[PDB]
Ligand binder design. Structure first.
Ligand SMILES: O=C(CO)[C@@H](O)[C@H](O)[C@H](O)COP(=O)(O)O
Ligand SMILES: O=C(CO)[C@@H](O)[C@H](O)[C@H](O)COP(=O)(O)O
Lengths: 351, 352
């Protein structure tokens, strides 16, 4: 290791781990995706009727991050479940379900108990893990190794974005026979090529993320607001800032703001809004104005080329542009960096 | 409001009557049957559907979370509960054999209404659970249930939430009325529904105890409300109540997700309310209480009044009467409704 913290290293490693996940799998010449661990099951999975993503903590947030593109490209119901809640409810599961179990370690008890429950119902089980030979990796019918390398830190960082990328790769396989989605998977794979270079462009803003931490050093709460593709971003951002900085960070769905949580907004409540260039732009802007009109001052994580938000907002963490279903990868990096720097400022052991 | 200053307070205290009104002409406690006459032109088709989708905003979404489990149990169907804004953002796949419920006090909430029109275009059977006769959601659905809570004049939903809760329970009871193996389960639930109004009066009797808890808490900036299973909705709804009218930074936390990051926020200084009721998640909840006290947290525990071990081993507890596990969520949310109110009065705001 070269850096101070394991977490810190693992964060800056992301332009390399992403490439490792796509290694011997993606091909940018002939637009083919191929996930070896699923090559014996991919046709049976393609005939299934629902996808269930079961996980705890940040591995659950990755499901949330890729729910939408999975629905769009499989045209199947996609259900994302927190493993503890899944087991408490005795969730209905059937033989034509494909159940995914996302777990970095492959040993989290609830996610594994969920695997056994699903297997007993006769569902097709799929592992998205980072630990070869782990319990979740062995006991599932098939699976994918995200290949992000070892993770020794307490907060997941590279594991999250590589869980992300692999689920997007799975989505690209599922829709490979459909004529109408040929262009759509082209633009997604172009973005997967540009991804590591653009992740490095985000790592360039460590300066601005370091000094944003010092302003929020004394603060006790921070509301992270996000829509659609970035609901996961805000949930995951809020979870890091909880876990390692011990500040009350809560992710809030932007569309739910007017239904109650808006009350929390005043001049003294710091807000981080994720307003990016996708189909929900106008609605994210309505959420901004609702916050401003309540006298809040939001640090907006926005697009680099979004002129009417860079000038119109005091603090902006400008992020490079990618295709809508990949932006979640880029826009979460500033928040995992902010979680690290606040932890340092308060004099805590990130590891 | 006869004696009350607040509409919200009046409406919370109205809940022993509004629950009766919700069940009037639907639950028969003389022969223990359930019928929702607003559905009878579609009930055959609904009974043959292959998935329920609940679509709503805010506390109406919470009413969905609060009833997801008994709906899965009694229907044996997948039940997916969706926040309406995010439902539209994703173009969620919907099919002709889906039954889509639209939970809305007002019956006009824009996202919930657009979710309705989206589901119709795809051929799903649509059902309105509203508190407003002749509203858009009531008119545009194929069938409906009016929850009969009465006008809600407060800004925060109280009686409507719990009426929506009972409504969805009634629907669940109806869906399993032909299963021999479930007759005792549903007789249990209906006995619970019949006792429920008096058990709310007993909860409302702790208005004093809840007042004095608010005096100890109202200076605080944050409070974590933790709970599991049936009471996950209780903690999300209580967290939204405390946000909406007190402006305190409350947040609902799934008890089973504590050990995955949120537990690091717990110490001597962070207020915590845990929900520990006598149901199948008891041991899992106690585990959650052990790791909160192990990190120096001194939580207020909402619990069963005859749970002698939680009452003795914790200083401040709110002692709630026991009912059926799938109804308990009605009793355990009320103290949080009242706390939100007394917490807000102490600070001094115009609750309505
Ligand atoms: O990493 C974090 C938070 O930074 C945890 O929330 C884990 O994501 C969770 O404990 C599941 O762990 P795995 O099941 O993925 O090993
Ligand atoms: O009352 C509250 C919170 O106490 C609101 O969150 C409403 O539940 C929401 O705005 C949806 O309203 P309806 O669609 O239920 O009318």
């Amino acid at each position: 290791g070269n850096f101070s913290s394991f977490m810190q290293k693992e964060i800056f490693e992301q332009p390399e781990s992403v490439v490792n996940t796509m290694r011997g799998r993606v091909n940018f010449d002939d637009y083919t995706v191929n996930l070896g661990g699923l090559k014996d099951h991919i046709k049976e999975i393609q005939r299934c009727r629902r996808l269930i993503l079961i996980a705890c903590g940040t591995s659950y947030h990755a499901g949330v991050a890729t729910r939408q593109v999975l629905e769009e490209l499989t045209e199947l119901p996609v259900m994302v479940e927190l493993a503890s809640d899944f087991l408490d409810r005795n969730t209905p599961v059937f033989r034509d379900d494909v159940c995914f179990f996302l777990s970095q370690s492959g040993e989290t008890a609830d996610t594994l108990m969920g695997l056994r429950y699903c297997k007993e119902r006769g569902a097709l089980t799929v592992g998205i893990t980072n630990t070869v030979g782990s319990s979740i990796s062995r006991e599932t019918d098939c699976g994918v190794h995200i290949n992000a390398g070892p993770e020794i830190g307490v907060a997941s960082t590279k594991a999250y974005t590589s869980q992300f990328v692999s689920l997007v790769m799975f989505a690209l396989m599922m829709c490979d026979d459909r004529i109408s989605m040929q262009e759509r998977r082209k633009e997604i794979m172009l973005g997967l090529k540009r991804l590591p270079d653009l992740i490095k462009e985000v790592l360039s803003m460590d300066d601005e993320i370091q000094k944003l931490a010092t302003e929020l050093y004394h603060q006790k709460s921070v509301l992270i607001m996000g829509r659609g593709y970035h609901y996961a971003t805000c949930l995951e951002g809020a979870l890091k800032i909880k876990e390692i900085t011990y500040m009350h960070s809560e992710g809030i769905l932007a569309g739910e703001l007017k239904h109650g949580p808006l009350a929390l907004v005043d001049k003294l409540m710091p807000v981080i809004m994720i307003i990016m260039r996708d189909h929900t732009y106008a609605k994210c802007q309505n959420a901004l104005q609702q916050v401003v009109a309540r006298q809040g001052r939001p640090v907006v994580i926005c697009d680099k080329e979004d002129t009417e938000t860079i000038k119109n907002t005091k603090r902006t963490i400008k992020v490079p542009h990618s295709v809508d279903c990949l932006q979640g990868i880029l826009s979460v990096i500033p928040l995992q960096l902010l979680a690290f720097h606040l932890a340092v400022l308060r004099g805590y052991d990130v590891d």
